[PDB]
Amino acid sequence: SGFRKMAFPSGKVEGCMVQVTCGTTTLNGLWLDDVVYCPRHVICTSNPNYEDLLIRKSNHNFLVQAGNVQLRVIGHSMQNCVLKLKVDTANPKTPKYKFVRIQPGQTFSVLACYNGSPSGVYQCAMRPNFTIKGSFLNGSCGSVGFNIDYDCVSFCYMHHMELPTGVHAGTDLEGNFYGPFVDRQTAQAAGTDTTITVNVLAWLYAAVINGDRWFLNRFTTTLNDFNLVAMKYNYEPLTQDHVDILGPLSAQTGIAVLDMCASLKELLQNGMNGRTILGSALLEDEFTPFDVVRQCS
């Protein structure tokens, strides 16, 4: 029993983290085979044209360090908002990996790093507004996000920056931003966010599997009538695909999805009346159906 925000074991990613320095800027890179991937921000100096900044660089300007071992840069290129530094040494710790872009509402593990040294690991969801609610300080740029499936690391996030509300923005490993953001100082701000309805329902199923039942009721609702309440409370609409994805959790608990939707309607309209669900006094939306199945009985 028990239900925790649980990260993937980080070892396969730790073996890939390196330090990249250009002039007086140090940040993190990801060393896979003979390439180091890092944010192109590393080449900026006190609205940059990055194509011009990169043409002015030489391989020898990039100081790449894997622990105590300097990696010699033998080529450099720009891919969107990331740099590809070709090095003289293939990483012998390269795991099986893929570069995948994730959807809003999906979760991943963040390996927070500084100076190429991993600091901590935690779970993040990609918000509907394409930000993440992480924990990052100066020097964290180039920290990565990932999921692991059968020892294959699916890298989905490279950290770039903090927005003014204290939420975080970054790119896929192809260097394409999540969301309407750019890798420079502008007045850019997080768009309005919404609650990830399918994830709240997954977490209510986790709560039932773990013996929290107080919020259940004999009532069912329609999908249309549920979606009217969702809109009112700034919840995402629930689709039949969402209902289908919640199939296994519904089967395991014997609680129909639209019966659980009647519970969530009552929680939105009434609150909890001083009660808690899985240790929370709020409705939690950063667990996917897969996160619940991965972890729960």
Ligand X SMILES: Cc1cc(CN(CCC2CCCCC2)C(=O)NC2CC2)no1
Figure out which of the listed residues 14, 34, 162, 212 binds ligand X, where binding follows CB under 6 A. 162
Listed in sequence order, the residues at least 6 apart from 121 whose beta carbon sits closer than 8 Å to its beta carbon are 7, 8, 10, 109, 110, 111, 112
Q: Which of 81, 113, 141, 296 is catalytic?
A: 141
Contact status: 279 vs a second copy (CB under 8 A):
yes
Binding of a second copy by 281 (CB under 8 A)? yes
Distances (CA, A) of 64 to 30, 34, 76, 85, 114: 11, 12, 12, 9, 14
x/- letters, 137..176, toward a second copy (CB under 8 A): x------------------------x---xxx--------
User: What amino acid occupies position 253?
Assistant: T
- To 5 degrees, how large is the angle CA 4–CA 257–CA 295? 20
CB of 167 to a second copy, least distance (A): 8
- State the binding partner of 160 from a second copy, ligand X, none, CB within 5 to 8 A by kind: ligand X
Report the nearest approach of ligand X to the CB of residue 7 (Å): 19
In angstroms, what CA-CA distances link 209 with 212, 219, 249, 278? 8, 19, 9, 11
Residue 102 structure tokens: 């994730």
Please select the residue that binds a second copy; options are 29, 105, 134, 142, rule is CB under 8 A.
134
Q: Are 20 and 35 in contact (CB under 8 A)?
A: no
User: Quick one: which of 29, 118, 139, 289 contacts a second copy (CB under 8 A)?
Assistant: 118
Query: Which residue number, 140 or 263, has a Cβ lying nearer to ligand X?
Result: 140
Near a second copy in 205-234, by CB under 8 A:
210-211
Q: Which does 161 bind (CB under 5 to 8 A by kind): ligand X, a second copy, none?
A: ligand X
105 binds a second copy (CB under 8 A): no
Measured CA to CA, the distance from residue 152 to residue 247 in angstroms comes to: 26
Query: Is 141 assigned a catalytic role?
Result: yes
> Residue 110 CB, nearest distance to a second copy (Å)?
8
- Distance (Å, whole) CA 276 – CA 69: 50
Residue that the structure tokens 């992480």 belong to: 134
Q: How far is the C-alpha of 26 from the C-alpha of 19, rounded, in Å?
A: 7
Rounded Cα gap, residues 218 and 259, in angstroms: 7
Question: Distance between CA 166 and CA 133 in Å, rounded?
Answer: 8
Q: Where along the sequence are the contacts to ligand X (CB under 6 A)? A: 1, 25, 27, 41, 136-141, 160-162, 183-185
Positions marked catalytic: 41, 141
Q: Where along the sequence are the contacts to a second copy (CB under 8 A)? A: 1-12, 14-15, 111-112, 118-122, 133-137, 162, 166-168, 210-211, 276, 279-282, 294-295, 297
